[PDB]
Symmetry: C2
Amino acid sequence: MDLLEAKRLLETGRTTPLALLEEALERAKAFQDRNALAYLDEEAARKEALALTEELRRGQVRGPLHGLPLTVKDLFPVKGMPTRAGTKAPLPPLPEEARAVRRLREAGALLFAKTNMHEIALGITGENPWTGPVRNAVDPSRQAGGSSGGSAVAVALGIGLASLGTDTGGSIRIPAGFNGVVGFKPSYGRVSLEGALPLSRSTDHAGPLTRSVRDAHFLTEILAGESIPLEGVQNPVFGVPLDFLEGRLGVEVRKAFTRLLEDLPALRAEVREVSLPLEGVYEVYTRLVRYEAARIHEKALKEHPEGFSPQVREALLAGLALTEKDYRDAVAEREALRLELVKALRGVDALLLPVQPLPAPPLGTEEVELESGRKGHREAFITLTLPFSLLGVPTLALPFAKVEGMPVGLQVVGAYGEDGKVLALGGWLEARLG
Amino acid sequence: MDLLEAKRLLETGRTTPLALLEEALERAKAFQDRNALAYLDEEAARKEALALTEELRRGQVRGPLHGLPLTVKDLFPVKGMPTRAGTKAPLPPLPEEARAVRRLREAGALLFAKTNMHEIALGITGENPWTGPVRNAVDPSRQAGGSSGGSAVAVALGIGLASLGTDTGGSIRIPAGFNGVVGFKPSYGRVSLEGALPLSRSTDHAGPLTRSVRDAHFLTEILAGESIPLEGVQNPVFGVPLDFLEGRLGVEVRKAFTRLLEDLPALRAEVREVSLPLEGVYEVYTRLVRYEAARIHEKALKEHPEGFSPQVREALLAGLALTEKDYRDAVAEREALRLELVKALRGVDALLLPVQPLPAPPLGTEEVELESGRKGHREAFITLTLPFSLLGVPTLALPFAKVEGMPVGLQVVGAYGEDGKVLALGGWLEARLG
């Protein structure tokens, strides 16, 4: 079941906050081999669940999420819970509770655990030598992906009804696709990242991982502290950046995506090719993010570099090697790319493209096979998502197909501020997809 | 007369390039004391004028601007002319001709002079101790304003039919307002700034100064190298950011603006209040721009600081005092404001607000009187324009009122990439204003 479904059961008295927690805890124990949780205090959780249950009986409701069990990516401070960000290195000062978390707590949600994540959110594999890897919800021998891997798996397996994560280069969308769940990255700044561990301040996005589009819409309003109206959808027009996708997809995802485009007309939708070159976007993003990330962890990298894994340590050092000039160039280059996206979105309701070039790869996979040849993991899996987080436009990731039994996600991209439209379009597609 | 009317006279054989030039040169001589020109070579100009005249007589049209006299702000390199940028300090290496200038030249335009500008474009007063102040076209005792001051005054006085300038925080719109001409700042990057002296690469904009909105559109298409469709206007809906304007207008401009709002309904238009807080936007803009500007002139500031005026030197030094950390924060703060502007524009065709809080003030005026009390000149006159250049959205400035017998301009703000819509709405308003 999902959030709104469980909410209705609570309102009709068919279930209780305590019961919902027990089911979540039961799933957490049965799927420990997935290693999705970074921190879990069953005792404190049960105590809180008891209070929420008794409150529901006395007629006291904290908010719209009252009694609903949720998890939080371990980069958001949560009261009574430690924050480790998947690393052994010290972290910069952070408050007791992130603003976004406060929104959930004040709404009555029951935050019962922190989810694992790729070390300091700098990576998308989900493999972590410090905490152990997070394993794919569908196949325990494949990657859960990242860096909100634990959150995605938790939601997929029923460990909590939803989860809160972050997306800088696709860290919400990628794991959502890998594990067959919904991941929404709102327009930049929509949801507050105050109090949370930063990676790339001008590119980080806070967002939900859910089992349905309606839950993503519902949760985003609470997280943003504002209503996001949903409009009706009829004869939607979808733009497809074929030039951008050329040679960036795997053979199987290519077939599934092509099939989707072929079936849309029958579903009464329209498919139009659009142009989205975005030349150099990969390195623009990489330099901008690594430069900022390295500065965030500069002190720890100097005093306690051994606290970082080899991959992260190398990435941070590479960021430190980038000069302020390199940063200024990247900043200017990002601004230059905006018009290109505006034009591509002009005339269509949203852009559609896979969120991944292949299904979740086996654990340890460093190179993958694309339709245009072998490519490095990072470049193959981050290129499809980074442009939209870099430019800050609302982007939803939802399941649209399967490859050899593994989930493959689809991206729905809208213009800046069109969060409601993207979610509306997402629900329309979700209903007509598998 | 304007560009398109002169172009009509040329096609009908009622005038020649040589005659159009002589007219421009007579005006330059007559109003020479306004000090609008930084460089003028009459002989070289006349020589080119002769060539264009003969070519036209034998049906050899170079382009849409063939034989039309135009001026260029002195930060854009022009063949056969020196580039001084209103300063005595050494400048970074620049090519012989700026890309935007090449667009004009290849169109057949007769570029006969460089216009003066606030030193290195870092300022909006138009006062320059090196070249002497550029004086307002209407009243030489008042500021021409800046930093495309000479360009606006030249256009206002008929010294050339149009001009090319830049706008980073309002450098095109402010002088246009002050002198009663049209100034258009297209979406960021639409007009190439390649080969031109930069101030803030991620915030600079190239744009035209004209006598009419139709000229602004005409020239922008040529400068951008692409056609910009002009859709009809019917029942336009204008958004007014009252909260943003609260206390930032002078009593008289407030009255003129209110009058316009009162008349729009009778003109078959709608006026809706919108919210645009943009708290701290002034500081964000200032730090971001000064940081980038200081790095451009870093070498000269160290080697020949005396080449910069005190005012400019102080701003540049403030830019060097800001660290890369301050820049990263400024970069993040800018992105945080983007959603606010997007939301204010949703549901309306454009935003309307004065381009200035008061008519051009006397030279040397450091403090002014706003409806909320005294305020420093810079903050009073840059705060109204900087948000739109900071965020890169198309913004038009056109005359709409008179105060103290001085011109007062109006800003028409559109969504990113909607230059055509802005220009169309500008034409609609122009035909219904004064």
